[PDB]
Design a protein around this ligand. Structure first.
Ligand SMILES: Nc1nc2c(ncn2[C@@H]2O[C@H](COP(=O)(O)OP(=O)(O)NP(=O)(O)O)[C@@H](O)[C@H]2O)c(=O)[nH]1
Ligand SMILES: Nc1nc2ccccc2n1Cc1ccc(Cl)cc1
Ligand SMILES: [Mg+2]
Ligand code: NA
Lengths: 167, 469, 166
């Protein structure tokens, strides 16, 4: 039937990464969530007029299980590499996440998007020009998202699906 | 009819329920949201006890109420005014007779004593199961001691004197089975010869048993204080979640050790024996319900350095390929089969903690702290109940001990395991991947041969236990 | 996984809490800390079926005797515990049996009669007298020691089987 895309969210912990998938999968208009509910990470969407099913793996909270990253990453067809725009270290981590994805998938051309996430009102420390330059150096899209208003969230996931479709 | 209550002007917990101060879910009621005053009223309700609510509240309340303020509020709850004599009592007294005091006696028996006892039960649970509030705030402890130590009156006396003693014991602070644990098993390494201990020289049954005891102890040591508020992800995680982080770092180190044992065995035949031995350890982990151990092994086999070793995988016996594949399928579809298996086995077990962490974090991030209703902000208690359902499941699997004997030398060997040495993580995992490329080069590079490194027999003793008289 | 709500009742000091903690943690509590109300959970396979036991540990002290209806309404089965070296605790059993029957409005409530502290030599309630009472109630009688674990699983899991067949 319809195509299913296995997407994987990766990025530093402790800086609101989990809000991206929560806001996507959520009842958009009721701020509520039970992650234990079977298929709280599956969503049927229409992208460019074609219906598909998103299966999103977000292991937020398990970042200290660093030897499990390979196993989790290998399940994915496309990757959202997420940093927080007020945490420079999480932005500096992106290079090694991308290198690890390429190794696990054994490909130099893995569908992925760079996501700069605004997780609170603390001062931004990564300017969008810096993140655009990094994404261009990798040949991948850059999307900025708000962890509170849902802005950019659909764009991040839909852009990644387009990267998969056009691979 | 119902008992009359004190005036809400002299006793705040007698205010009527309304949607402006409490909201119930759709046979005791379940609270969706409420003011802190209403939460404490229902925590100590005169009509029924709710021990699960006490645990939920004491586990999660610090996200909406400070410990010092909680103590002030339950002391306020405790100090209930007694009603005045009724008209019939008045008329008896005016005639020099003793009043019946029917309404006063009922209010004592059916309101004051149950509420006061339930306040004391909150104090008792607080001290016994959430004592860290008092370890971290000596003045809070002094206030609790003073409150308990000055409760007068004979109805509460037994529990006041008991709680005083419990507090004193907690300040200065044994397992029975009727079956004997099985005999410790030895292979090439003999007892006391710790310098020869290694993956292939210890008995694979005993490797799995001693890692299960170690991992069970690490699992059982994690308290809810390390989890609520997602504190293991925040900047102070080393301060607030030390037992959890020790447990995770053990799991990571063991996975890396398995990978290192594999890729540093350059001879193909020897490496097949190493991988086969690790799968035998995985089989014993499965038999012991050590799911953390199962996934430590599966994570190693799915790592980039090991996963690509097609020549090694080809020679693994079919029955061991099936054991590894079955273990891997536990994690598929967001751990569907693992979750079902955990809920079906007979404990003791060692759960995989990572799923709990993700679910606690997402519950906290995905639900608001307050609900706004009729201009008022109500504490969203349903969110805290969901968190406490997870911490309660964790605690349920922490109760049952393993009937296995500790071997102190094998325990120390695995406690001191340090596969990374002084290397940083990236340097070390790049080393492992480069070893993988050395021992099985990318096609079309030919497969080289390598000399043996082990001087002792590679044949496994197997994983079925032995039993001499 | 089926869930079972068990309630442990009986006079103060007979060992309700020690029995429960021995079941849950395999540990014997030496201290006598009078209970107000505690609850425990245990996943366990019984007769090949996994279930989840919710165990309510109640107050034996007479000062809490007016607070029992609420927990008797919710419980599905009851361990009625006395101590075999305390005759008064055995005489108290019938008050608990009658109250449970009144509250649940039923003559057919799952129950097990438990004679605890059977590790102690100085017995004052004979097994025959307790067995006669259990027969008059239609329920089994199991002697236990929270100290040695004798009979402990038998008592709780027998009660589960009675709820299951109810
Ligand atoms: N020798 C022996 N002592 C026991 C046994 N069970 C309990 N005790 C002891 O008897 C005392 C009372 O036990 P406890 O479990 O607190 O009794 P309880 O029925 O829960 N009391 P309460 O109704 O006040 O909560 C404790 O000192 C405990 O160690 C047993 O099987 N054998
Ligand atoms: N083919 C395969 N089936 C698996 C099931 C679960 C985990 C890993 C699995 N691999 C890769 C593998 C395992 C072990 C070695 Cl030594 C070399 C490659
Ligand atoms: Mg007790
Ligand atoms: Na920064």
């Amino acid at each position: 039937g319809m195509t299913e895309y296995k997407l994987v969210v990766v990025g530093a912990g402790g800086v609101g990464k989990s809000a991206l998938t929560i806001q996507l999968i959520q009842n958009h208009f009721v701020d509520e969530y039970d992650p234990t509910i079977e298929d709280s990470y599956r969503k049927q969407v229409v992208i460019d007029g074609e219906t598909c099913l998103l299966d999103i793996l977000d292991t937020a909270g398990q970042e200290e299980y660093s030897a499990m990253r390979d196993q989790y990453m290998r399940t994915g067809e496309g990757f959202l590499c997420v940093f927080a725009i007020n945490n420079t270290k999480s932005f500096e981590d992106i290079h090694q996440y991308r290198e690890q994805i390429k190794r696990v998938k054994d490909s130099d051309d893995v569908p992925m998007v760079l996501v700069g996430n605004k997780c609170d009102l603390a001062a931004r420390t990564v300017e969008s020009r810096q993140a655009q330059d990094l994404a261009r150096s990798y040949g991948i899209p850059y999307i900025e998202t708000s962890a509170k208003t849902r802005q950019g969230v659909e764009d991040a996931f839909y852009t990644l699906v387009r990267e998969i479709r056009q691979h | 009819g119902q008992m009359r209550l004190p005036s809400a002007d002299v006793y705040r917990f007698a205010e009527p329920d309304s949607e402006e101060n409490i909201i119930f879910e759709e046979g005791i009621p379940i609270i969706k949201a409420g003011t802190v005053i209403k939460l404490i009223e229902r925590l100590t309700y005169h009509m029924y006890a709710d021990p699960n609510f006490v645990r939920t509240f004491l586990t999660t309340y610090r996200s909406f109420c400070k410990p010092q303020e909680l103590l002030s509020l339950i002391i306020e709850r405790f100090e209930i005014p007694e009603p005045e004599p009724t008209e019939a009592d008045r008329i008896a007294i005016e005639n020099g007779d003793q009043p019946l005091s029917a309404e006063l006696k009922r209010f004592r028996k059916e309101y004051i004593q149950p509420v006061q006892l339930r306040v004391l039960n909150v104090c008792r649970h607080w001290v016994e199961h959430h004592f860290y509030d008092f370890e971290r705030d000596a003045y809070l402890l002094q206030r609790m001691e003073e409150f308990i130590g000055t409760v007068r009156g004979k109805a509460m006396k037994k529990w006041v004197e008991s709680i005083t003693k419990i507090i004193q014991r907690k300040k200065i602070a044994n397992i029975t089975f009727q079956s004997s644990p099985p005999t410790v098993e030895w292979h090439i390494s003999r007892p006391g010869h710790i310098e020869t201990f290694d993956l292939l020289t210890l008995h694979p049954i005993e490797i799995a048993r001693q890692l299960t005891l170690l991992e069970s102890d690490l699992y059982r040591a994690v308290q809810p204080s390390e989890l609520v508020g997602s504190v293991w992800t925040k900047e102070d995680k080393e301060i607030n979640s030390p037992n959890l982080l020790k447990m995770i770092r053990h799991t990571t180190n063991l996975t890396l050790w398995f990978e290192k044992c594999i890729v540093e065995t350059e001879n193909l035949e020897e490496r097949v024996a190493v991988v086969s031995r690790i799968i035998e350890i995985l089989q014993v982990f499965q038999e012991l319900n050590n799911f953390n151990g199962v996934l430590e092994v599966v994570s190693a086999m799915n790592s980039s350095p090991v996963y690509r070793l097609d020549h090694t995988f080809e020679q693994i016996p079919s029955r061991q390929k099936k054991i590894l594949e079955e273990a891997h399928e536990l994690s598929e579809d967001h751990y569907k089969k693992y979750l079902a298996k955990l809920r079906s086995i007979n404990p003791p077990c060692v759960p995989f903690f990572g799923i709990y962490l993700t679910n606690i974090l997402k519950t906290e991030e995905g639900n608001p702290e307050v609900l706004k209703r009729h201009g008022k902000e109500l504490i969203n208690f349903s969110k805290r109940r969901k968190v406490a359902e997870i911490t309660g499941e964790i605690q349920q699997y922490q109760n049952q001990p393993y009937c296995l004997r500790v071997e102190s030398d094998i325990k120390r060997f695995f406690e001191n395991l340090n596969p990374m040495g002084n290397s940083m993580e990236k340097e070390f995992t790049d080393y492992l991947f480069n070893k993988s490329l050395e021992i099985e080069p990318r096609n079309p590079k030919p497969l080289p041969r390598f000399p043996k490194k082990y001087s002792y027999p590679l044949k496994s003793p197997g994983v079925r236990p032995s039993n001499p008289r």
